[PDB]
Motif scaffolding. Structure first.
Motif, PDB file in Angstrom:
ATOM      1  N   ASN A 266      -5.940  52.273  23.158  1.00 17.69           N
ATOM      2  CA  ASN A 266      -6.889  51.314  22.597  1.00 17.69           C
ATOM      3  C   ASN A 266      -6.202  50.011  22.244  1.00 17.69           C
ATOM      4  N   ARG A 267      -6.362  49.007  23.112  1.00 10.60           N
ATOM      5  CA  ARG A 267      -5.606  47.771  22.969  1.00 10.60           C
ATOM      6  C   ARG A 267      -6.153  46.883  21.845  1.00 10.60           C
ATOM      7  N   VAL A 268      -7.154  47.353  21.089  1.00  5.94           N
ATOM      8  CA  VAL A 268      -7.470  46.769  19.778  1.00  5.94           C
ATOM      9  C   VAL A 268      -6.225  46.755  18.906  1.00  5.94           C
ATOM     10  N   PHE A 269      -5.429  47.814  18.997  1.00  5.51           N
ATOM     11  CA  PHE A 269      -4.191  47.924  18.232  1.00  5.51           C
ATOM     12  C   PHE A 269      -3.051  47.289  19.025  1.00  5.51           C
ATOM     13  N   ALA A 270      -3.077  45.965  19.031  1.00  6.36           N
ATOM     14  CA  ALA A 270      -2.031  45.172  19.650  1.00  6.36           C
ATOM     15  C   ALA A 270      -1.985  43.862  18.888  1.00  6.36           C
ATOM     16  N   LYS A 271      -0.775  43.383  18.621  1.00  2.00           N
ATOM     17  CA  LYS A 271      -0.607  42.126  17.901  1.00  2.00           C
ATOM     18  C   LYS A 271      -0.730  40.976  18.889  1.00  2.00           C
ATOM     19  N   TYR A 272      -1.759  40.142  18.725  1.00  2.00           N
ATOM     20  CA  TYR A 272      -1.960  39.008  19.618  1.00  2.00           C
ATOM     21  C   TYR A 272      -1.604  37.703  18.918  1.00  2.00           C
ATOM     22  N   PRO A 273      -0.721  36.877  19.482  1.00  2.00           N
ATOM     23  CA  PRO A 273      -0.472  35.556  18.889  1.00  2.00           C
ATOM     24  C   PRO A 273      -1.694  34.668  19.056  1.00  2.00           C
ATOM     25  N   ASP A 274      -1.725  33.582  18.278  1.00  2.00           N
ATOM     26  CA  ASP A 274      -2.949  32.786  18.253  1.00  2.00           C
ATOM     27  C   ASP A 274      -3.161  31.981  19.527  1.00  2.00           C
ATOM     28  N   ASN A 275      -2.222  32.004  20.465  1.00  2.00           N
ATOM     29  CA  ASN A 275      -2.360  31.251  21.702  1.00  2.00           C
ATOM     30  C   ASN A 275      -2.731  32.129  22.892  1.00  2.00           C
ATOM     31  N   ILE A 276      -3.088  33.393  22.654  1.00  2.00           N
ATOM     32  CA  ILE A 276      -3.630  34.275  23.682  1.00  2.00           C
ATOM     33  C   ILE A 276      -4.937  34.849  23.156  1.00  2.00           C
ATOM     34  N   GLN A 277      -6.018  34.730  23.935  1.00  2.00           N
ATOM     35  CA  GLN A 277      -7.281  35.304  23.482  1.00  2.00           C
ATOM     36  C   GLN A 277      -7.230  36.817  23.479  1.00  2.00           C
ATOM     37  N   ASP A 278      -7.830  37.393  22.445  1.00  2.00           N
ATOM     38  CA  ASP A 278      -7.768  38.823  22.178  1.00  2.00           C
ATOM     39  C   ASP A 278      -9.096  39.420  22.629  1.00  2.00           C
ATOM     40  N   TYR A 279      -9.163  39.766  23.917  1.00  2.00           N
ATOM     41  CA  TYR A 279     -10.387  40.303  24.507  1.00  2.00           C
ATOM     42  C   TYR A 279     -10.878  41.533  23.763  1.00  2.00           C
ATOM     43  N   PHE A 280      -9.954  42.352  23.279  1.00  2.00           N
ATOM     44  CA  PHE A 280     -10.341  43.636  22.715  1.00  2.00           C
ATOM     45  C   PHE A 280     -10.956  43.475  21.337  1.00  2.00           C
ATOM     46  N   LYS A 281     -10.356  42.646  20.486  1.00  2.00           N
ATOM     47  CA  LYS A 281     -10.966  42.431  19.185  1.00  2.00           C
ATOM     48  C   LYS A 281     -12.272  41.641  19.272  1.00  2.00           C
ATOM     49  N   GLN A 282     -12.557  40.976  20.387  1.00  2.00           N
ATOM     50  CA  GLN A 282     -13.830  40.281  20.552  1.00  2.00           C
ATOM     51  C   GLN A 282     -14.932  41.156  21.134  1.00  2.00           C
ATOM     52  N   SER A 283     -14.648  42.416  21.450  1.00  2.00           N
ATOM     53  CA  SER A 283     -15.584  43.294  22.146  1.00  2.00           C
ATOM     54  C   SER A 283     -16.477  44.094  21.205  1.00  2.00           C
ATOM     55  N   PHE A 284     -16.344  43.925  19.911  1.00  2.00           N
ATOM     56  CA  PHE A 284     -17.123  44.741  19.006  1.00  2.00           C
ATOM     57  C   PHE A 284     -18.264  43.947  18.373  1.00  2.00           C
ATOM     58  N   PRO A 285     -19.329  44.618  17.892  1.00  2.00           N
ATOM     59  CA  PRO A 285     -19.485  46.059  17.630  1.00  2.00           C
ATOM     60  C   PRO A 285     -19.807  46.954  18.831  1.00  2.00           C
ATOM     61  N   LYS A 286     -20.261  46.431  19.977  1.00  2.00           N
ATOM     62  CA  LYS A 286     -20.605  47.308  21.097  1.00  2.00           C
ATOM     63  C   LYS A 286     -19.378  48.053  21.618  1.00  2.00           C
ATOM     64  N   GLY A 287     -18.229  47.397  21.644  1.00  2.00           N
ATOM     65  CA  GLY A 287     -17.009  48.027  22.110  1.00  2.00           C
ATOM     66  C   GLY A 287     -16.695  47.714  23.562  1.00  2.00           C
ATOM     67  N   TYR A 288     -15.840  48.553  24.131  1.00  2.00           N
ATOM     68  CA  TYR A 288     -15.362  48.327  25.487  1.00  2.00           C
ATOM     69  C   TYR A 288     -14.937  49.660  26.066  1.00  2.00           C
ATOM     70  N   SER A 289     -14.616  49.646  27.356  1.00  2.00           N
ATOM     71  CA  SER A 289     -14.136  50.850  28.014  1.00  2.00           C
ATOM     72  C   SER A 289     -12.991  50.494  28.949  1.00  2.00           C
ATOM     73  N   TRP A 290     -12.181  51.491  29.286  1.00  2.00           N
ATOM     74  CA  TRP A 290     -11.161  51.258  30.301  1.00  2.00           C
ATOM     75  C   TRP A 290     -11.111  52.441  31.254  1.00  2.00           C
ATOM     76  N   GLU A 291     -10.648  52.168  32.473  1.00  3.05           N
ATOM     77  CA  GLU A 291     -10.396  53.172  33.507  1.00  3.05           C
ATOM     78  C   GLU A 291      -8.999  52.958  34.060  1.00  3.05           C
ATOM     79  N   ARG A 292      -8.254  54.050  34.231  1.00  4.91           N
ATOM     80  CA  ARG A 292      -6.830  53.961  34.517  1.00  4.91           C
ATOM     81  C   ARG A 292      -6.437  54.936  35.613  1.00  4.91           C
ATOM     82  N   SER A 293      -5.595  54.474  36.526  1.00  8.07           N
ATOM     83  CA  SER A 293      -4.937  55.353  37.476  1.00  8.07           C
ATOM     84  C   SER A 293      -3.461  55.423  37.120  1.00  8.07           C
ATOM     85  N   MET A 294      -2.897  56.613  37.251  1.00  8.51           N
ATOM     86  CA  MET A 294      -1.483  56.856  36.995  1.00  8.51           C
ATOM     87  C   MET A 294      -0.937  57.533  38.239  1.00  8.51           C
TER      88      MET A 294
END
Length: 214
Positions: free
Chosen positions: A60-88
């Motif tokens: 959950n990339r909500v838990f990431a420290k973002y400096p003020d010069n990079i937009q924080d897509y994850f903290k802007q996704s609430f209250p609806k939230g977000y999803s991710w899909e990953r291949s390993m």
């Protein structure tokens, strides 16, 4: 909406090489420091017959420290939230696919995780539980075809000192339609199993993530 201290609730349903399992988590974190810890407990399918380490980055990339010069897509996704899909894609042919749907109620993030793994060799380090830890990594975040994407070349340290490579690709999508994509950037990650019981039925997990422009 997102407080300096937040709680986390998680349920993962998984199937790895035909073995089904369910794992619950409860944790706490500081979203603006990019730190979080989780207590995990296997609720079905224990004892797991494969390396717990293959699961830990899905917890959950909500838990990431973002400096003020990079937009924080994850903290802007609430209250609806977000999803991710990953291949390993593991170097020996093992392949995993995972998805998380992240929502929020009150001071708690809720995670619904699905994890599918297959084609792990019977005598490989995953099915033989010979992994030790993920090495610190850097996730490259960028936009491909209008979708926020993160790529990582990961490595699991093995018993004996060899490394076992895995290529990650994750796509990230806000649930609200008009959420502006961020600029490209990097996220440094480290993830650690702080403790576990003998069969890994109970695991304490920690992650620290920091975004940067270089």
């Amino acid at each position: 909406a997102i407080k300096p201290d937040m709680k986390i609730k998680l349920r993962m349903e998984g199937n790895v090489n035909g073995h089904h399992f369910v794992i619950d988590g409860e944790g706490t974190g500081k979203p603006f420091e990019g730190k979080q810890s989780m207590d995990l407990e296997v609720k079905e399918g224990g004892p797991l017959p494969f390396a717990f380490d293959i699961l830990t980055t899905a917890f959950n990339r909500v838990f990431a420290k973002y400096p003020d010069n990079i937009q924080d897509y994850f903290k802007q996704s609430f209250p609806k939230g977000y999803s991710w899909e990953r291949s390993m894609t593991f170097e020996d042919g093992g392949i995993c696919n995972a998805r998380n749907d992240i929502t929020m109620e009150g001071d708690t993030f809720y995670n619904k995780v699905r994890f599918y793994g297959t084609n792990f060799p019977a005598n490989g380090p995953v099915m033989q539980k010979k992994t030790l830890k993920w090495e610190p990594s850097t996730e490259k975040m960028y936009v491909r075809d209008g979708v926020l994407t993160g790529d990582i070349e990961m490595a699991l340290l093995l018993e004996g000192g060899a490394h076992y490579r895995c290529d990650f690709r994750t796509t990230y999508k806000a649930k609200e339609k008009g959420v502006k994509l961020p600029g490209a950037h990097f996220v440094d990650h480290c993830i650690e199993i702080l403790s576990h019981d003998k069969d890994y039925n109970k695991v304490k997990l920690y992650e620290h993530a920091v975004a940067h422009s270089g």
